[PDB]
Protein backbone atom coordinates (compact mmCIF):
# COMPACT_ATOMS: atom_id res chain seq x y z
CA UNK A 1 0.00 0.00 0.00
CA UNK A 2 1.13 3.54 -0.76
CA UNK A 3 2.89 5.45 2.01
CA UNK A 4 4.30 8.98 2.29
CA UNK A 5 1.65 10.43 -0.01
CA UNK A 6 3.47 13.62 -0.98
CA UNK A 7 3.04 14.84 -4.54
CA UNK A 8 5.29 16.44 -7.13
CA UNK A 9 5.75 20.20 -7.15
CA UNK A 10 7.53 22.91 -9.10
CA UNK A 11 10.44 24.28 -7.08
CA UNK A 12 11.19 27.99 -6.99
CA UNK A 13 13.16 30.16 -4.59
CA UNK A 14 11.67 31.93 -1.58
CA UNK A 15 11.18 35.22 -3.42
CA UNK A 16 9.81 33.64 -6.64
CA UNK A 17 7.74 36.39 -8.29
CA UNK A 18 6.30 33.50 -10.33
CA UNK A 19 5.30 31.44 -7.29
CA UNK A 20 1.66 32.52 -7.26
CA UNK A 21 0.96 32.32 -10.99
CA UNK A 22 2.67 28.93 -11.35
CA UNK A 23 0.35 27.40 -8.75
CA UNK A 24 -2.69 29.11 -10.25
CA UNK A 25 -1.69 27.72 -13.64
CA UNK A 26 -1.43 24.21 -12.19
CA UNK A 27 -4.81 24.15 -10.46
CA UNK A 28 -6.27 25.55 -13.67
CA UNK A 29 -4.70 22.76 -15.73
CA UNK A 30 -6.13 20.08 -13.44
CA UNK A 31 -9.63 21.47 -13.87
CA UNK A 32 -9.24 21.93 -17.64
CA UNK A 33 -8.24 18.29 -18.03
CA UNK A 34 -4.80 19.25 -19.35
CA UNK A 35 -3.06 17.02 -16.80
CA UNK A 36 -5.36 14.14 -17.72
CA UNK A 37 -4.10 14.68 -21.27
CA UNK A 38 -0.53 14.35 -20.03
CA UNK A 39 -1.33 11.25 -17.99
CA UNK A 40 -2.91 9.63 -21.05
CA UNK A 41 0.01 10.37 -23.36
CA UNK A 42 2.90 9.69 -20.95
CA UNK A 43 1.72 7.57 -18.00
CA UNK A 44 -1.21 5.38 -19.12
CA UNK A 45 0.25 2.99 -21.70
CA UNK A 46 -0.31 -0.53 -20.29
CA UNK A 47 2.03 -2.52 -22.51
CA UNK A 48 1.48 -5.80 -20.64
CA UNK A 49 0.00 -6.89 -17.31
CA UNK A 50 -1.70 -9.75 -15.50
CA UNK A 51 -3.96 -10.38 -12.52
CA UNK A 52 -2.97 -12.02 -9.25
CA UNK A 53 -4.99 -15.21 -9.81
CA UNK A 54 -5.09 -15.12 -13.63
CA UNK A 55 -6.47 -18.50 -14.77
CA UNK A 56 -4.36 -19.73 -17.66
CA UNK A 57 -5.46 -21.53 -20.80
CA UNK A 58 -4.01 -24.96 -21.55
CA UNK A 59 -1.44 -24.75 -24.35
CA UNK A 60 0.22 -27.56 -26.29
CA UNK A 61 3.11 -27.69 -23.83
CA UNK A 62 0.46 -28.79 -21.30
CA UNK A 63 -1.45 -31.24 -23.51
CA UNK A 64 1.51 -32.69 -25.43
CA UNK A 65 1.66 -35.71 -23.13
CA UNK A 66 -1.72 -37.09 -24.17
CA UNK A 67 -1.16 -36.13 -27.81
CA UNK A 68 1.96 -38.32 -27.72
CA UNK A 69 -0.16 -41.29 -26.61
CA UNK A 70 -2.48 -41.31 -29.61
CA UNK A 71 0.64 -41.00 -31.77
CA UNK A 72 2.24 -43.83 -29.80
CA UNK A 73 -0.92 -45.87 -30.24
CA UNK A 74 -0.47 -45.67 -34.01
CA UNK A 75 3.09 -47.00 -34.14
CA UNK A 76 1.96 -49.65 -31.67
CA UNK A 77 -0.98 -50.30 -33.97
CA UNK A 78 1.11 -50.71 -37.12
CA UNK A 79 3.05 -53.28 -35.14
CA UNK A 80 -0.06 -54.96 -33.71
CA UNK A 81 -1.56 -55.27 -37.20
CA UNK A 82 1.23 -57.65 -38.24
CA UNK A 83 0.49 -59.91 -35.27
CA UNK A 84 -3.19 -59.85 -36.23
CA UNK A 85 -2.61 -61.39 -39.67
CA UNK A 86 0.17 -63.64 -38.36
CA UNK A 87 -2.13 -64.95 -35.63
CA UNK A 88 -4.91 -65.48 -38.18
CA UNK A 89 -2.49 -67.09 -40.64
CA UNK A 90 -1.88 -70.00 -38.26
CA UNK A 91 -5.59 -70.61 -37.63
Amino acid sequence: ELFFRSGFGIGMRKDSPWKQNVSLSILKSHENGFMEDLDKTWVRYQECDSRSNAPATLTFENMAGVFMLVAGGIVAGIFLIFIEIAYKRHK
Binding site: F3, F4, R5, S6, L27, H30, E31, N32, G33, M35, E36, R51, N53, A54, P55, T57, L58, T59, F60, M63, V66, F67, L69, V70, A71, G73, I74, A76, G77, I78, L80, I81, E84, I85, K88
Partner: protein, 281 residues
Protein backbone atom coordinates in the same frame (compact mmCIF):
# COMPACT_ATOMS: atom_id res chain seq x y z
CA UNK B 1 -16.06 -21.63 -23.59
CA UNK B 2 -13.17 -20.46 -25.77
CA UNK B 3 -10.89 -19.92 -22.77
CA UNK B 4 -9.38 -23.37 -22.07
CA UNK B 5 -7.43 -25.16 -24.79
CA UNK B 6 -5.50 -22.54 -26.71
CA UNK B 7 -6.48 -22.73 -30.38
CA UNK B 8 -3.34 -24.75 -31.13
CA UNK B 9 -4.69 -27.62 -29.00
CA UNK B 10 -8.01 -27.71 -30.86
CA UNK B 11 -6.24 -27.56 -34.23
CA UNK B 12 -3.91 -30.43 -33.36
CA UNK B 13 -6.83 -32.59 -32.22
CA UNK B 14 -8.48 -32.12 -35.62
CA UNK B 15 -5.33 -33.06 -37.53
CA UNK B 16 -4.71 -35.98 -35.18
CA UNK B 17 -8.31 -36.99 -35.83
CA UNK B 18 -7.63 -37.07 -39.57
CA UNK B 19 -4.36 -38.93 -38.98
CA UNK B 20 -6.04 -41.54 -36.79
CA UNK B 21 -8.99 -41.84 -39.18
CA UNK B 22 -6.82 -42.48 -42.23
CA UNK B 23 -4.61 -45.02 -40.46
CA UNK B 24 -7.61 -46.88 -39.02
CA UNK B 25 -9.40 -47.24 -42.37
CA UNK B 26 -6.46 -47.71 -44.76
CA UNK B 27 -3.90 -49.63 -42.68
CA UNK B 28 -5.84 -51.16 -39.80
CA UNK B 29 -9.20 -52.03 -41.37
CA UNK B 30 -8.21 -52.71 -44.98
CA UNK B 31 -5.30 -54.94 -43.91
CA UNK B 32 -7.17 -56.70 -41.10
CA UNK B 33 -8.27 -60.29 -41.82
CA UNK B 34 -11.80 -59.34 -40.68
CA UNK B 35 -13.34 -56.20 -42.14
CA UNK B 36 -21.05 -52.07 -44.14
CA UNK B 37 -17.58 -50.74 -44.98
CA UNK B 38 -15.64 -48.62 -42.50
CA UNK B 39 -14.72 -45.50 -44.51
CA UNK B 40 -13.43 -42.00 -43.83
CA UNK B 41 -16.95 -40.61 -43.52
CA UNK B 42 -17.82 -42.91 -40.64
CA UNK B 43 -14.35 -42.75 -39.10
CA UNK B 44 -14.39 -38.96 -38.76
CA UNK B 45 -17.93 -39.28 -37.40
CA UNK B 46 -16.91 -41.99 -34.92
CA UNK B 47 -13.81 -40.24 -33.58
CA UNK B 48 -15.53 -36.85 -33.52
CA UNK B 49 -18.41 -38.18 -31.45
CA UNK B 50 -16.01 -39.84 -29.02
CA UNK B 51 -14.35 -36.50 -28.26
CA UNK B 52 -17.67 -34.75 -27.70
CA UNK B 53 -19.11 -36.98 -24.98
CA UNK B 54 -19.95 -39.97 -27.15
CA UNK B 55 -23.67 -39.67 -27.83
CA UNK B 56 -24.18 -39.99 -31.61
CA UNK B 57 -24.96 -43.20 -33.52
CA UNK B 58 -21.75 -44.61 -34.99
CA UNK B 59 -20.33 -47.72 -36.68
CA UNK B 60 -17.36 -49.23 -34.86
CA UNK B 61 -14.63 -51.01 -36.85
CA UNK B 62 -14.56 -54.79 -36.92
CA UNK B 63 -10.79 -55.24 -36.97
CA UNK B 64 -9.07 -56.04 -33.70
CA UNK B 65 -6.28 -53.54 -34.40
CA UNK B 66 -8.69 -50.76 -35.36
CA UNK B 67 -10.63 -51.42 -32.15
CA UNK B 68 -7.43 -50.86 -30.16
CA UNK B 69 -6.86 -47.57 -31.98
CA UNK B 70 -10.39 -46.38 -31.24
CA UNK B 71 -9.89 -47.43 -27.62
CA UNK B 72 -6.68 -45.42 -27.25
CA UNK B 73 -8.55 -42.55 -28.88
CA UNK B 74 -11.38 -42.97 -26.38
CA UNK B 75 -8.82 -42.60 -23.61
CA UNK B 76 -7.62 -39.35 -25.17
CA UNK B 77 -11.21 -38.13 -25.39
CA UNK B 78 -11.92 -38.70 -21.69
CA UNK B 79 -8.76 -36.77 -20.82
CA UNK B 80 -9.65 -34.08 -23.36
CA UNK B 81 -13.13 -33.59 -21.91
CA UNK B 82 -11.96 -33.89 -18.30
CA UNK B 83 -9.34 -31.22 -18.95
CA UNK B 84 -11.77 -29.00 -20.87
CA UNK B 85 -14.34 -29.02 -18.08
CA UNK B 86 -11.76 -28.73 -15.31
CA UNK B 87 -10.26 -25.60 -16.86
CA UNK B 88 -13.67 -24.15 -17.71
CA UNK B 89 -14.58 -24.41 -14.03
CA UNK B 90 -11.26 -22.80 -13.12
CA UNK B 91 -12.09 -19.86 -15.37
CA UNK B 92 -15.60 -19.39 -14.01
CA UNK B 93 -14.37 -19.66 -10.41
CA UNK B 94 -11.66 -17.06 -11.04
CA UNK B 95 -13.10 -14.33 -13.27
CA UNK B 96 -13.02 -10.68 -12.25
CA UNK B 97 -15.59 -8.17 -13.48
CA UNK B 98 -15.40 -5.29 -15.95
CA UNK B 99 -17.07 -2.06 -14.86
CA UNK B 100 -19.78 -1.03 -17.29
CA UNK B 101 -18.89 2.69 -17.13
CA UNK B 102 -15.44 3.93 -18.14
CA UNK B 103 -15.26 7.48 -16.86
CA UNK B 104 -16.60 11.02 -16.92
CA UNK B 105 -16.04 11.13 -20.71
CA UNK B 106 -18.14 8.04 -21.43
CA UNK B 107 -20.97 7.96 -23.95
CA UNK B 108 -23.60 7.82 -21.20
CA UNK B 109 -22.28 10.95 -19.49
CA UNK B 110 -21.78 12.82 -22.77
CA UNK B 111 -25.14 12.12 -24.45
CA UNK B 112 -27.48 10.06 -22.24
CA UNK B 113 -30.64 10.67 -24.26
CA UNK B 114 -29.04 9.75 -27.59
CA UNK B 115 -27.94 6.49 -25.93
CA UNK B 116 -30.09 3.67 -24.46
CA UNK B 117 -32.88 4.56 -21.95
CA UNK B 118 -31.56 7.62 -20.18
CA UNK B 119 -28.65 7.36 -17.76
CA UNK B 120 -29.57 9.01 -14.45
CA UNK B 121 -26.62 10.87 -12.91
CA UNK B 122 -26.56 13.95 -10.72
CA UNK B 123 -24.64 15.77 -8.03
CA UNK B 124 -25.04 17.96 -4.96
CA UNK B 125 -25.01 21.60 -6.15
CA UNK B 126 -23.33 24.72 -4.74
CA UNK B 127 -19.97 22.97 -4.52
CA UNK B 128 -16.84 22.54 -6.63
CA UNK B 129 -18.04 19.56 -8.69
CA UNK B 130 -20.63 21.77 -10.37
CA UNK B 131 -18.09 24.55 -10.86
CA UNK B 132 -15.84 21.99 -12.53
CA UNK B 133 -18.74 20.66 -14.61
CA UNK B 134 -20.31 24.01 -15.54
CA UNK B 135 -16.99 25.12 -17.00
CA UNK B 136 -15.98 21.84 -18.67
CA UNK B 137 -19.13 19.92 -19.66
CA UNK B 138 -21.92 22.37 -20.48
CA UNK B 139 -24.26 19.77 -21.98
CA UNK B 140 -23.66 17.50 -18.97
CA UNK B 141 -24.54 20.28 -16.53
CA UNK B 142 -27.94 20.94 -18.12
CA UNK B 143 -28.97 17.28 -17.98
CA UNK B 144 -27.65 17.01 -14.41
CA UNK B 145 -29.80 19.84 -13.06
CA UNK B 146 -32.98 17.77 -12.98
CA UNK B 147 -31.22 14.99 -11.01
CA UNK B 148 -29.86 17.20 -8.22
CA UNK B 149 -29.35 15.71 -4.76
CA UNK B 150 -29.80 17.61 -1.52
CA UNK B 151 -26.97 15.79 0.26
CA UNK B 152 -24.55 12.90 0.07
CA UNK B 153 -26.75 10.55 2.10
CA UNK B 154 -29.71 11.21 -0.19
CA UNK B 155 -27.70 10.22 -3.26
CA UNK B 156 -26.47 7.08 -1.49
CA UNK B 157 -30.04 5.84 -1.00
CA UNK B 158 -31.20 6.98 -4.44
CA UNK B 159 -28.53 4.76 -6.00
CA UNK B 160 -29.83 1.72 -4.13
CA UNK B 161 -33.47 2.47 -4.93
CA UNK B 162 -32.71 3.08 -8.61
CA UNK B 163 -33.58 6.77 -9.05
CA UNK B 164 -29.90 7.37 -9.88
CA UNK B 165 -27.29 5.09 -11.41
CA UNK B 166 -24.21 7.30 -10.93
CA UNK B 167 -23.36 9.94 -8.32
CA UNK B 168 -20.66 12.46 -9.26
CA UNK B 169 -19.07 13.94 -6.15
CA UNK B 170 -15.83 14.49 -4.26
CA UNK B 171 -13.46 11.54 -4.40
CA UNK B 172 -12.44 11.42 -0.74
CA UNK B 173 -16.06 11.39 0.43
CA UNK B 174 -17.14 8.82 -2.16
CA UNK B 175 -14.20 6.59 -1.25
CA UNK B 176 -15.36 6.62 2.37
CA UNK B 177 -19.03 6.00 1.58
CA UNK B 178 -18.06 3.21 -0.81
CA UNK B 179 -15.90 1.85 2.01
CA UNK B 180 -18.29 1.42 4.94
CA UNK B 181 -21.17 0.23 2.76
CA UNK B 182 -23.11 -2.89 3.69
CA UNK B 183 -22.86 -5.66 1.12
CA UNK B 184 -20.11 -3.67 -0.67
CA UNK B 185 -22.55 -3.01 -3.51
CA UNK B 186 -21.70 0.67 -4.13
CA UNK B 187 -18.35 1.19 -5.84
CA UNK B 188 -16.48 4.02 -7.53
CA UNK B 189 -15.65 3.53 -11.20
CA UNK B 190 -12.08 3.08 -12.33
CA UNK B 191 -11.23 1.30 -9.06
CA UNK B 192 -10.84 4.73 -7.51
CA UNK B 193 -10.32 6.88 -10.60
CA UNK B 194 -10.12 10.60 -9.83
CA UNK B 195 -10.76 13.46 -12.25
CA UNK B 196 -9.83 17.13 -11.83
CA UNK B 197 -7.38 15.95 -9.21
CA UNK B 198 -6.86 18.32 -6.28
CA UNK B 199 -6.74 18.17 -2.50
CA UNK B 200 -8.24 19.42 0.72
CA UNK B 201 -6.50 22.49 2.11
CA UNK B 202 -6.78 24.83 5.06
CA UNK B 203 -8.02 28.18 3.80
CA UNK B 204 -6.17 31.11 5.39
CA UNK B 205 -6.64 34.84 4.91
CA UNK B 206 -4.92 36.14 1.80
CA UNK B 207 -1.52 37.75 2.42
CA UNK B 208 -1.10 36.45 5.96
CA UNK B 209 1.88 35.29 7.95
CA UNK B 210 0.37 31.97 9.00
CA UNK B 211 0.37 30.28 5.59
CA UNK B 212 4.03 29.31 5.88
CA UNK B 213 3.63 28.04 9.44
CA UNK B 214 0.62 25.88 8.58
CA UNK B 215 2.25 24.53 5.42
CA UNK B 216 5.38 23.34 7.21
CA UNK B 217 3.28 21.77 9.97
CA UNK B 218 1.20 19.72 7.51
CA UNK B 219 4.34 18.55 5.71
CA UNK B 220 5.76 17.45 9.06
CA UNK B 221 2.78 15.15 9.59
CA UNK B 222 3.50 13.37 6.31
CA UNK B 223 7.17 12.99 7.21
CA UNK B 224 6.52 11.97 10.82
CA UNK B 225 3.92 9.43 9.69
CA UNK B 226 0.75 10.73 11.33
CA UNK B 227 -1.17 10.88 8.05
CA UNK B 228 -1.19 7.12 7.53
CA UNK B 229 -2.24 6.65 11.16
CA UNK B 230 -5.08 9.13 10.63
CA UNK B 231 -6.07 7.47 7.36
CA UNK B 232 -6.39 4.06 9.01
CA UNK B 233 -8.31 5.53 11.95
CA UNK B 234 -10.89 7.54 9.98
CA UNK B 235 -10.95 6.75 6.26
CA UNK B 236 -10.61 2.96 6.45
CA UNK B 237 -13.49 0.72 5.50
CA UNK B 238 -14.81 -2.81 5.42
CA UNK B 239 -15.00 -3.02 1.62
CA UNK B 240 -11.48 -1.69 1.07
CA UNK B 241 -9.98 -5.06 2.04
CA UNK B 242 -11.06 -6.85 -1.14
CA UNK B 243 -14.15 -9.88 -5.67
CA UNK B 244 -15.52 -12.93 -7.50
CA UNK B 245 -19.23 -13.74 -7.29
CA UNK B 246 -21.27 -16.59 -8.72
CA UNK B 247 -23.30 -15.59 -11.77
CA UNK B 248 -25.89 -17.31 -13.94
CA UNK B 249 -25.32 -18.09 -17.62
CA UNK B 250 -27.83 -15.97 -19.52
CA UNK B 251 -27.88 -15.81 -23.32
CA UNK B 252 -25.65 -12.73 -23.39
CA UNK B 253 -22.92 -14.86 -21.81
CA UNK B 254 -23.65 -17.83 -24.09
CA UNK B 255 -24.19 -15.89 -27.31
CA UNK B 256 -20.84 -17.19 -28.51
CA UNK B 257 -21.88 -20.84 -28.50
CA UNK B 258 -25.09 -20.02 -30.37
CA UNK B 259 -23.29 -18.01 -33.05
CA UNK B 260 -21.01 -21.00 -33.57
CA UNK B 261 -24.14 -23.12 -33.96
CA UNK B 262 -25.86 -20.47 -36.06
CA UNK B 263 -22.80 -20.34 -38.30
CA UNK B 264 -22.88 -24.11 -38.77
CA UNK B 265 -26.41 -23.49 -40.00
CA UNK B 266 -24.74 -21.14 -42.49
CA UNK B 267 -21.98 -23.59 -43.41
CA UNK B 268 -24.51 -26.39 -43.91
CA UNK B 269 -26.32 -24.36 -46.58
CA UNK B 270 -23.14 -23.63 -48.53
CA UNK B 271 -22.18 -27.30 -48.79
CA UNK B 272 -25.82 -28.18 -49.46
CA UNK B 273 -25.79 -25.59 -52.24
CA UNK B 274 -22.37 -26.74 -53.42
CA UNK B 275 -23.74 -30.29 -53.69
CA UNK B 276 -26.35 -29.26 -56.25
CA UNK B 277 -23.82 -27.30 -58.29
CA UNK B 278 -21.48 -30.30 -58.17
CA UNK B 279 -24.39 -32.63 -58.95
CA UNK B 280 -25.45 -30.57 -61.97
CA UNK B 281 -21.95 -30.93 -63.42
Amino acid sequence: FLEPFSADVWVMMFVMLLIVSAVAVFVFEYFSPVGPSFTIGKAIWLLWGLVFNNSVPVQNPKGTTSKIMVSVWAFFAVIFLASYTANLAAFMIQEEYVDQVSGLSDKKFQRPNDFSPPFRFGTVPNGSTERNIRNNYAEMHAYMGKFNQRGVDDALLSLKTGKLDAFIYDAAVLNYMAGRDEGCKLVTIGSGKVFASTGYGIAIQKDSGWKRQVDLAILQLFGDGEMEELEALWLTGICHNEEVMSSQLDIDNMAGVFYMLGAAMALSLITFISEHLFYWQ
